Amino acid sequence: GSSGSSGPQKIFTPSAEIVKYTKIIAMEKLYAVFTDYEHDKVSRDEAVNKIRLDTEEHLKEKFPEVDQFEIIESFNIVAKEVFRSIILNEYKRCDGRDSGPSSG
């Protein structure tokens, strides 16, 4: 057993069970907020962060046994995950031509 962060020693990851459910909610929203709030710069600032507070109340509720630190730290990993996927449809080049239906 060990504890305390120091050196090249990596940190432990949160609960996967949640992280997964965090995407179904974080994703949808994150995408619903990204697609919109273009004109306004701050309008999107709150839309994104807001989730961090929303999901936290939507997850910690589903997992009453899980720790609060598992509902937050988990999201972080989820967020970054989405963004990347969003960058594939904006600020990119030669993403990958398509022959058939893209959105079906």
Of 3.90.1150.10, 1.10.10.400, 3.40.50.2300, 3.90.1150.50, which CATH number belongs to 1-104?
1.10.10.400
Rounded alpha-carbon distances, angstroms, from residue 91 to 35, 77, 87, 94: 14, 22, 6, 11
CA–CA separation, 49 and 33 (whole Å):
10
CA–CA separation, 22 and 77 (whole Å):
10
PDB experimental method: NMR
- Give the closest residue to 55 by CA, choosing from 12, 14, 13: 14
Judging by beta carbons within 10 Å of its beta carbon (0-12, 13-18, 19+), is residue 73 exposed, middle or buried? middle
